[PDB]
DNA sequence: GCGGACTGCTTACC
Ligand SMILES: Cc1cn([C@H]2C[C@H](O)[C@@H](COP(=O)(O)OP(=O)(O)OP(=O)(O)O)O2)c(=O)[nH]c1=O
Ligand SMILES: [Ca+2]
Ligand SMILES: [Ca+2]
Ligand SMILES: [Ca+2]
Ligand SMILES: [Ca+2]
Ligand SMILES: [Ca+2]
């Protein structure tokens with residue numbers, strides 16, 4: 001097989017690399033890499049190297065990496081540019097692996113681990129590491145085994161061995177319900193003291209050294225705690241055995257927080273993977289909370305506080321440690337962020353941990369792309385931060401909208417890049433710009449007949465291929481493939497959801513199919529014969545396939561969009577606001593241009609004139625009021641809801657899209673662009689159910705609307721799905737129960753009507769005080785707590801949630817055992833009625849947790865339900881209903897005087 | 900006593 005790297009590090013004049021050889025074995029080699037950098041030279045000096053602008057350069061080979069660094073500094077002192085890859089690790093990887101890396105994941109040691117630390121005095125600071133590590137579970141992906149290190153003897157208690165029999169038993173059975181599919185993969189090891197556990201762990205680590213190291217919060221807790229604990233006990237030299245190169249780096253942040261860097265290891269903390277790649281914003285990021293959200297597994301329920309869990313129930317203590325490690329594996333099997341990371345990493349030829357940085361990722365990609373043409377990359381330069389203009393957003397008239405069709409452009413900014421051919425080395429020149437609306441209205445003089453143009457004034461060559469458009473097209477093509485798989489899985493999902501209305505009573509088995517492809521007629525035929533058993537399991541498998549596809553497409557989308565954004569970041573080698581602005585300005589033109597073209601087409605094809613059909617639009621989308629389109633054919637001529645949905649689908653697909661294609665084709669001509677790539681396709685088909693009192697949709701303002709959707713990008717929903725953007729139902733700061741209640745109000749408004757809404761509202765208002773306090777608590781990040789802390793009391797302009805935290809601190813003040821609110825993390829927030837014993841109007845505590853028993857009963861007693869209902873529920877509901885022009889409560893009328 | 904304008908903070912949409 002082709003060789004491929006695992007990890008790479010620069011240590012002085014040496015590149016330390018771990019790699020899988022052509023025989024499949026893991027090796028490690030120390031290479032004294034001789035890097036090359038470049039300097040401009042006279043034209044007369046023949047060469048094969050040129051910078052991206054065509055200027056010749058001479059290659060400077062250095063005896064070592066240190067000599068190359070010094071040269072860079074002297075070239076700075078002289079005042080001349082030093083070209084080439086200054087991150088020598090990237091240069092090494094590029095040289096060593098001059099080919100598309102095909103890797104074998106089964107050969108990469110992926111380690112998932114989690115540790116337990118009993119601490120009687122609050123959170124055990126990893127920097128201090130004063131308390132014993134009394135449990136470690138370490139999953140090795142090559143062995144496919146859970147290595148469990150259990151401390152039986154500790155200054156905090158002596159305990160019996162953990163029982164795997166009991167662990168496997170149902171909770172109802174007194175057991176721990178450690179998933180049966182892993183019981184056989186557990187390798188259990190008890191220890192009579194910590195030193196022996198730790199030393200044993202280090203020896204295990206040496207035989208099975210992680211390449212990818214992950215887990216939940218491993219970077220901020222597990223790793224630094226293990227490192228410092230071992231360092232405190234055995235000394236630093238022993239601690240450094242955690243690095244296959246015996247080199248670590250302690251980077252410190254004073255508030256004492258430490259982040260350790262283990263050379264030769266790529267740490268991908270899963271919480272960081274999840275935050276960057278999941279596209280969620282969660283009220284809490286405890287593994288308990290995320291596991292529930294992702295896998296629908298129950299919360300690991302134990303009696304008593306964690307600080308006393310080991311002493312009282314060591315059996316469950318260890319089982320929960322094992323389960324916590326497995327839950328991250330389960331989440332990854334679903335989301336597949338480790339696969340994504342490996343993929344990206346080997347594509348760009350970077351350290352795997354650098355997938356968190358789109359700039360490093362693209363710098364490496366572009367660099368490799370340019371290296372192949374014997375071209376030389378420019379030196380990084382210093383730039384001041386500058387604001388610059390972005391997308392256009394249409395101000396919508398607040399109102400209801402019965403029938404709505406939406407259209408969106410495909411990969412807008414990356415497409416704009418490819419079309420215009422925007423790249424650092426494809427810049428041709430500039431032109432005198434007319435006001436933006438002159439280009440939008442097609443009044444302005446054609447910018448150029450020789451070059452490709454943006455309305456920001458930039459001109460680019462139409463013949464020369466750009467390195468940026470070239471490499472952004474490659475990833476875009478990947479993105480497009482996976483989206484195909486995603487949508488197919490989605491369409492298959494719906495097919496199964498409908499079939500679940502004819503559950504055929506029988507004992508059957510789930511059909512063998514690749515959900516990434518639209519079910520064949522044969523398969524669709526079979527499906528209509530299965531029962532809830534086989535159907536529900538195919539639905540699950542279809543949804544897992546869809547999610548896997550989502551991860552792959554949405555993060556390649558993120559990557560390419562991040563290349564756009566990078567052009568607007570001063571730390572990007574190819575930073576250039578000429579290009580970044582060329583993209584955004586072109587975008588503003590494109591959108592408002594098609595707004596006009598679409599309006600023109602519809603006023604004509606409908607017959608009317610001067611009517612505004614586009615009611616809203618954001619960046620690259622338009623929402624077309626389709627009332628007049630439906631009215632033409634009249635509602636009578638429709639058999640059911642699905643009928644007119646078919647109608648609009650066909651209408652948009654047959655008439656509107658070709659018209660839009662024509663509109664953009666002309667625009668591309670106007671700007672003399674390299675290639676027409678403005679592909680606007682239909683998005684949503686929304687409207688109330690046929691013959692109902694539902695309003696279909698509504699807008700309250702920019703980025704705040706709801707739509708009752710029947711079709712989305714070709715997927716016809718078995719049941720109508722609510723598309724809600726911006727509204728309180730979508731925000732993580734909104735209490736769970738309020739989100740749910742607000743959503744039902746919206747569903748009722750859009751699907752059923754005013755009467756139904758008032759019915760539900762009256763009900764919710766009556767019963768809402770029985771809601772669990774957590775479900776009705778607000779959520780918020782807690783930044784700069786100390787900034788507003790004046791003697792434990794709110795300083796000037798102290799934010800509401802911060803006030804709540806202070807209230808909390810005072811309430812628990814003194815109790816070293818009470819849960820502490822962490823700077824930067826999130827908190828639940830509740831209002832307290834006047835006269836409460838807390839001495840303030842609100843209180844806050846760490847999100848995703850029950851508030852400490854110390855004060856729980858008092859908080860429950862003094863909750864201000866009235867303020868809760870009015871601030872979090874009624875006010876937003878008032879905004880929804882006012883805009884749509886409805887009332888959530890029956891108004892008083894002249895009829896109120898009749899019996 | 901408190902509404903309207905401005906600010907900080909937070910969390911959306913693209
Ligand atoms: C979502 C998102 C969009 N944008 C910009 C660039 C996008 O092209 C533009 C529109 O975003 P989107 O229309 O939401 O997504 P997309 O057009 O890039 O690709 P697709 O529609 O097929 O899913 O807004 C960002 O810069 N960053 C982002 O995270
Ligand atoms: Ca011993
Ligand atoms: Ca788009
Ligand atoms: Ca059936
Ligand atoms: Ca054209
Ligand atoms: Ca099309």
Ligand SMILES: [Ca+2]
Pocket residue numbers: 408409410681682683713
């Ligand atoms: Ca689309």
Ligand code: NA
Pocket residue numbers: 114115116324
């Ligand atoms: Na833990």
Ligand code: NA
Pocket residue numbers: 170171172177
């Ligand atoms: Na159970």
Ligand code: NA
Pocket residue numbers: 228231232
């Ligand atoms: Na120490």
Ligand code: NA
Pocket residue numbers: 502528
């Ligand atoms: Na049937």
Ligand code: NA
Pocket residue numbers: 603604607608609
């Ligand atoms: Na006309």
Ligand code: NA
Pocket residue numbers: 408409618619620621
């Ligand atoms: Na969009």
